[PDB]
């Protein structure tokens, strides 16, 4: 049997980056040729491994994480990066062994009146550890006084909404991302 990569890339709905989705891939023959031979991908950078030489490598588990961010924020999905996404939504380790794949999805994830279904975490006291998934909705206490779960001054909703409209610049249109994590065996080529 073959690995369910077609489920991830050709998925109908993608998750918001703060609540990024994780698929655990195991016990399957992985055909990586379907990916690096595709001309529909705008970003495809691999770390600690070669793209063409992956059908010759065995790993214990493969992790595919998928979410939606801004095109401006694709540069942050990489080891040693900082930013509103890398710090507070999805963080890669410095010793990352895997590949980051992205492509524009303005035709799907932008509505005429503005798509607000895709969100990103804007407020957090400290940075995320590698592969940390923070889905908290607690009101952010930016001031001296406590919030008690009520919004107001110095008490803000920690998430912010992307305004995905078709008229947006390249950097502001939605991009769908899939992060493959190779862990070292049940997934080979």
């Amino acid at each position, epitope marked *: 049997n073959l690995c369910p990569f077609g489920e991830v890339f050709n998925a109908t709905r993608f998750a918001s980056v703060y609540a990024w989705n994780r698929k655990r891939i195991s016990n399957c023959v992985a055909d990586y040729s379907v990916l690096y031979n595709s001309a529909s991908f705008s970003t495809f950078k691999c770390y600690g491994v070669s793209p063409t030489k992956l059908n010759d490598l065995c790993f214990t588990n493969v992790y595919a994480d998928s979410f939606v961010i801004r095109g401006d924020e694709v540069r942050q999905i990489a080891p040693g990066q*900082t930013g*509103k996404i890398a*710090d507070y939504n999805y963080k890669l380790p410095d010793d990352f062994t895997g590949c980051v794949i992205a492509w524009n999805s303005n035709n799907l994830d932008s509505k005429v009146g503005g798509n607000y279904n895709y969100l990103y975490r804007l407020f*957090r006291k400290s*940075n995320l550890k590698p592969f940390e998934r923070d889905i908290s909705t607690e009101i952010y206490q930016a001031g001296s006084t406590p919030c008690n779960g009520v919004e107001g001054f110095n008490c803000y909703f920690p998430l912010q909404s992307y305004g995905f409209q078709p008229t947006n610049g390249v950097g502001y249109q939605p991009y769908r991302v899939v992060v493959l994590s190779f862990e070292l065996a049940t997934v080979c080529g």
Partner: antibody
Amino acid sequence: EVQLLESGGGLIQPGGSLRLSCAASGFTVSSNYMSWVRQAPGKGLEWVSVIYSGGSTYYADSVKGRFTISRDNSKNTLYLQMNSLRAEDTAVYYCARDHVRPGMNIWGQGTMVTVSS
Amino acid sequence: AIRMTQSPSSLSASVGDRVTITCQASQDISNYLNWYQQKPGKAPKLLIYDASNLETGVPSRFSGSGSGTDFTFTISSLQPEDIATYYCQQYDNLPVTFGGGTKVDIKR
């Protein structure tokens, strides 16, 4: 009420150093986005540095490697360490709680840094 | 790095005249553009945030519109205390960049 008070500006020889303190009241510095913005005499505004809520620091190209930004949670104070100062660093230095949402944008009153001999 | 261009550099208008200044962005900055009023000697004061939204406490005579790359800042009826230098800034994309400024004088 809520206000930003800053100090530390004055005369300093070129190549010297100078730290600017920005004391806050009404909010937590370690929890907000803070920014330094300088205005040369007669000129426009120039963004300098930013510290995020999580701690990530960013600097302008003209001061990168020379200026440093930090904060003290116990004192609720924003700092700006300036090293290898040049004559073109002479300006008023405003510290500001960066605008992120409706009504949180607040600016200091600036201190005059005069780099001369 | 983005470069904001602000026209006009200087301006003089009568009390009550409609005053409009523009700020064109070098790249797309969506609507992440703010407007500041800097009276002489004092610090800049945020008037319009996110291109068109009025900060709490600003008089209604201050207006803003625009998205993408071209924006406008409108004073409905100019008042004597409105004399200042007005700047535009983008902040979503780093580094943060300002406009050249617009000095406004009253024609009395």
